[PDB]
């Protein structure tokens, strides 16, 4: 006990990649719904 292990570096890059990929996905759904609403009207 009392080892004080650190999660250090690029494990955080995996975490940031999660956040970035999810923001990408939600913007993709934005593009779908707006692009379909464009061919709705007249």
Neighbouring CB atoms inside 10 A of 24's CB total 9
CA dist., res. 11 & res. 8, Å (int): 7
* Distance between CA atoms of residues 26 and 37, nearest Å: 17
Half-sphere exposure of 15 (CA within 13 A, CB side): 6
The C-alpha atoms of residue 24 and residue 15 are separated, in whole angstroms, by 15
Query: Which own/partner contact pairs does 17-24 have at CB distance under 8 Å and 24+ positions apart?
Result: none
Name the experiment that determined this structure: cryo-EM
Can you read off the two tokens belonging to residue 30?
Answer: 């934005």
């Amino acid at each position: 006990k009392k080892n004080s292990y650190s999660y250090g570096w690029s494990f955080y890059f995996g975490a940031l990649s999660f956040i970035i990929a999810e923001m990408v996905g939600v913007l993709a759904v934005h593009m779908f719904i707006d692009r379909h609403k464009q061919l709705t009207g007249g």
